[PDB]
Design a protein around this ligand. Sequence first.
Ligand SMILES: *[C@@H]1O[C@H](CO)[C@@H](O[C@@H]2O[C@H](CO)[C@@H](O)[C@H](O)[C@H]2NC(C)=O)[C@H](O[C@@H]2O[C@@H](C)[C@@H](O)[C@@H](O)[C@@H]2O)[C@H]1NC(C)=O
Ligand SMILES: *[C@@H]1O[C@H](CO)[C@@H](O[C@@H]2O[C@H](CO)[C@@H](O)[C@H](O)[C@H]2NC(C)=O)[C@H](O[C@@H]2O[C@@H](C)[C@@H](O)[C@@H](O)[C@@H]2O)[C@H]1NC(C)=O
Ligand SMILES: *[C@@H]1O[C@H](CO)[C@@H](O)[C@H](O)[C@H]1NC(C)=O
Ligand SMILES: *[C@@H]1O[C@H](CO)[C@@H](O)[C@H](O)[C@H]1NC(C)=O
Ligand SMILES: *[C@@H]1O[C@H](CO)[C@@H](O)[C@H](O)[C@H]1NC(C)=O
Ligand SMILES: *[C@@H]1O[C@H](CO)[C@@H](O)[C@H](O)[C@H]1NC(C)=O
Ligand code: VN3
Ligand SMILES: [Fe+3]
Ligand SMILES: [Fe+3]
Ligand code: NA
Ligand code: NA
Ligand SMILES: [Zn+2]
Ligand SMILES: [Zn+2]
Lengths: 423, 426
Amino acid sequence: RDMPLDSDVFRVPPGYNAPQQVHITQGDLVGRAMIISWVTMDEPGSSAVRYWSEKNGRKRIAKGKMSTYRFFNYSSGFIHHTTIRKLKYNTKYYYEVGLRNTTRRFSFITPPQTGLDVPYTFGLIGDLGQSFDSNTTLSHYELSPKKGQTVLFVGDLSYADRYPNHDNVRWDTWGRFTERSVAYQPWIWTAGNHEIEFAPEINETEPFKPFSYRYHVPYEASQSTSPFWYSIKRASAHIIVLSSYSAYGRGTPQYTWLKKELRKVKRSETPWLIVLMHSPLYNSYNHHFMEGEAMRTKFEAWFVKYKVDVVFAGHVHAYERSERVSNIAYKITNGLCTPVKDQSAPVYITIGDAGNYGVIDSNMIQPQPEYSAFREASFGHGMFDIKNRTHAHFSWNRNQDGVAVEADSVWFFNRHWYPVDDS
Amino acid sequence: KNRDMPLDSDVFRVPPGYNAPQQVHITQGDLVGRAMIISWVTMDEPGSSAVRYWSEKNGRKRIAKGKMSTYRFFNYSSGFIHHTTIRKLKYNTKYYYEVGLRNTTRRFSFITPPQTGLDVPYTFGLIGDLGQSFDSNTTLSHYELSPKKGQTVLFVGDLSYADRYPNHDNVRWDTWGRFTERSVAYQPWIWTAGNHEIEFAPEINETEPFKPFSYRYHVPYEASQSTSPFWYSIKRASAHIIVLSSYSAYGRGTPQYTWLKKELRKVKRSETPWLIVLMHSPLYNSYNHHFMEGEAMRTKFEAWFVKYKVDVVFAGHVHAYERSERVSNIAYKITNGLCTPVKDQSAPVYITIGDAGDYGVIDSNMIQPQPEYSAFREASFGHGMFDIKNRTHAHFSWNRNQDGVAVEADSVWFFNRHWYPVDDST
Ligand SMILES: *[C@@H]1O[C@H](CO)[C@@H](O[C@@H]2O[C@H](CO)[C@@H](O)[C@H](O)[C@H]2NC(C)=O)[C@H](O[C@@H]2O[C@@H](C)[C@@H](O)[C@@H](O)[C@@H]2O)[C@H]1NC(C)=O
Ligand SMILES: *[C@@H]1O[C@H](CO)[C@@H](O[C@@H]2O[C@H](CO)[C@@H](O)[C@H](O)[C@H]2NC(C)=O)[C@H](O[C@@H]2O[C@@H](C)[C@@H](O)[C@@H](O)[C@@H]2O)[C@H]1NC(C)=O
Ligand SMILES: *[C@@H]1O[C@H](CO)[C@@H](O)[C@H](O)[C@H]1NC(C)=O
Ligand SMILES: *[C@@H]1O[C@H](CO)[C@@H](O)[C@H](O)[C@H]1NC(C)=O
Ligand SMILES: *[C@@H]1O[C@H](CO)[C@@H](O)[C@H](O)[C@H]1NC(C)=O
Ligand SMILES: *[C@@H]1O[C@H](CO)[C@@H](O)[C@H](O)[C@H]1NC(C)=O
Ligand code: VN3
Ligand SMILES: [Fe+3]
Ligand SMILES: [Fe+3]
Ligand code: NA
Ligand code: NA
Ligand SMILES: [Zn+2]
Ligand SMILES: [Zn+2]
């Protein structure tokens, strides 16, 4: 069910050395920067980005870096990453790439300065892939009247690793296909298991290699030492991105980083505390049942201690919304291993249903457990729409519904600023 | 509070002569025991990485050529580290070897193991969390003086504790190398990485995990088709030893997870009936210190250990001694309430042996009451011995530093899970 190579969504932008696979993401901690990324296929080209605000109309130049990689017998084109800095808040910018030969122009709008009541609408997309289902989900997202301003992407991007030798051409197609969204609004990247691409049989033993060359993240801005875990702040939200497939034992870099990062969160500046990871800690579907248990034993108690509002994950190709529950009272021999209602705990949402390679996960463990509020095996996407420091509205849209139809929706009451039972 | 041996202690003396090799240490260099990695440091100049070696019988002297490396850690600059692999050795024979051939030569010896086989006896020492306190020295002394005669040390992690010093003062890696040489220059120590080897110190711009340890202690990880030094397998006599990394990734689909799943399928109990796992952090631990830190890895690998009938899992990290019953806790399914360990005669025994001395502190606070899964636990310094007699029987003993070197405060017969799975409860 993967879209054929000649699909319209995979068309090559015309013109000699025209930039393609253009994508942007936040480039700093607070929203004044953007990483601009693209690929040129005919020759290295310039890594310069020309950009200007609509407000001041002053054309500026930022210089970046070009890189290449190989994977088995695949050789990449020329990958460009350029960080535009010192941007004004809440301002429309135009930017151009391909300054030496064929120039292409895009735009984005910077977020407002971080603050207590700053509204912002986040899209939720996971396990996207490049099937016709993937295209429908992307269409529904961009047609949504809630108007997403940034996608929180919970992992499993291209599924290129399903192809012979992970045929990395399917990374190039995915980049051309997603450009119509991510060239104009940031996607916040989480690494999933299809990004691991550990393939010792063809001597590719470096985890996350193609993904890490193609998708950069501002990980140094939160004093992380690795691209696979990091934080950003945007509007009223503090977003923590974790790596299900990296080390998280006590004392490891990721564990150390997260422990310190949670102490740095200021709910008086960013009231909405959001965690992204690929593998869900709470999941009542058959597929990947209990894979999240290892990270849960390490980090669940911290999520409760710090009153995380919501944890988004993918991996399971379906939709699930938990109750606020915790399973943190276990001590090996005390028998306390059943999740209980816990209003201090986040809501766990699985949103890995954007299409993958066309397969939905319909097998559910029955009956629906007490910890699960709502689950359905349909393709779709989410929207987390912050109104102010106390209220955020989450909605789930199905591909088989109208683009303005929400099959599930719930009001989030903030755990720090308004801890009322939002059951 | 500071019980570390002072820099001028006799165990830290520098071998005399210009560029004399120091911190000499060996470990198995291949999968089956026909090779040895020879390692050492020269301090005055790079020197030669050549190793001269010969058996005590035929006496034909050969040269193996190795590689030199250096590293920096903050304001520390290492000396010149040599690693050289001697290959194609004969089984069960004594070899002499010489390092420092350019200037000051020093000579040592080792005895290769017998060829792997079903009924091959072999005596393994167990040492965890050694450190360089006076307690550490006593433990090493007790091991060297054992009447049972250890032939290889299985070391379950936390080596030098240099990371406790300001800027992890890597001089304390050098001292530890000189201190331990009296043992490890003559018999292999099998290295497991512990949390004191991570040395993740972003505050001083040292962010490469395991850097000083991995420069100083090499392992034959390619021999078992691992892509990382931090997890690997070796076979020695009748034992198949799997070394895991508590502080590397082990999620589904990760390199270590993938490697272990495939490696367990390669185990042949008719060739190496004793299946032994090493890791730093214990999956079963009834002490307060580090209680339940092993849960995450336990969720991933415990069921595999039972499926493959691992005989024993050795760990350190807790600075005390513990021996579990044969139990498993693998039946949990979130909502089925099955989260209590049960007797399980396919399961390994879990032994915590992280009590060789560290920086001088014992972990004495225990979970009360002693849980059913715990057979024996005691907060004393000491070390262990896993003495394989044959394919059905291995004798494990625990010697305390406060006792005579021949006294075993705890001991138990292991009955092999493949050839003789009798209840061997204490
Ligand atoms: C924070 O955002 C909430 C969601 O928009 C606000 O609630 C909404 O307030 C409207 C009046 O401004 C009201 O018609 C809507 O029904 C309501 N939506 C709900 C409750 O889901 C909230 O407004 C405060 O709380 C509500 C319950 C009323 O008491 C309002 O008068 C309050 O202003 C916003 N909080 C603010 C603005 O402080
Ligand atoms: C493997 O080694 C075991 C320990 O040395 C052997 O058991 C010991 O056998 C002695 C002489 O047969 C006997 O005096 C000891 O009591 C006994 N030790 C223990 C702890 O049981 C074992 O020998 C077999 O097993 C024992 C239990 C008897 O049935 C013997 O008759 C058997 O030969 C060795 N097993 C082998 C070589 O297969
Ligand atoms: C993908 O969806 C877009 C927007 O609905 C449509 O124009 C395009 O033809 C689709 N391409 C496919 C399904 O290959
Ligand atoms: C890579 O190798 C496969 C065979 O394993 C072949 O079919 C494919 O065309 C090769 N691709 C390139 C770009 O050489
Ligand atoms: C490294 O810095 C420490 C702390 O300032 C100092 O005591 C030590 O002598 C230094 N080591 C060097 C410069 O080799
Ligand atoms: C360490 O132990 C050895 C052997 O028991 C002894 O000769 C030496 O003096 C000790 N060194 C210390 C305690 O510093
Ligand atoms: O083999 V002779 O140099 O002691
Ligand atoms: Fe997926
Ligand atoms: Fe220790
Ligand atoms: Na699974
Ligand atoms: Na996992
Ligand atoms: Zn996945
Ligand atoms: Zn430890």
